[PDB]
């Protein structure tokens, strides 16, 4: 397993190392998205949680998409306002439940070190 903490301070530089085979040893749920939501990678910690098939989703819009529930002001509006900001750190929990037993989980979101790519890291609560 890959040593990385969910919500660790350095994160965005520990995950800049790693391919999508090593984003899968991660003990967490991990979504790489572009500035307009695009998934560019989804490891399987998320898939476990939320059943959707990693290579399946990459390349489709993730608000739009595949989870509508996250399209709010709570979700994806924080989203929106990091990215127009170029800066965008926040923890919270919310509720999965598009086309899936509702699930309680924390949500981290994270400007990468990249340019415009941006993490979001989930665990279940
Ligand atoms: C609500 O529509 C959430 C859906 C969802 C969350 C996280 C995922 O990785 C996939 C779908």
């Given at each position: 397993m890959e040593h990385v903490a969910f919500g660790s301070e350095d994160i965005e530089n520990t995950l800049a190392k790693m391919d999508d085979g090593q984003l899968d040893g991660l003990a967490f749920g991990a979504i790489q998205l572009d500035g307009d939501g695009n998934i560019l990678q989804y490891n399987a910690a998320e898939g476990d949680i939320t059943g959707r098939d990693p290579k399946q989703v990459?390349?489709?819009?993730?608000?739009?998409?595949?989870?509508?529930?996250?399209?709010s002001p709570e979700f994806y509006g924080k989203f929106k306002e990091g990215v127009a900001s170029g800066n965008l750190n926040t923890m919270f929990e919310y509720t999965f439940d598009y086309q899936m037993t509702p699930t309680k989980v924390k949500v981290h979101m994270k400007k990468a070190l990249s340019g415009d790519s941006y993490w979001v890291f989930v665990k279940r609560v």
């Open positions: 990459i390349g489709k819009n993730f608000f739009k998409d595949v989870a509508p529930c996250t399209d």
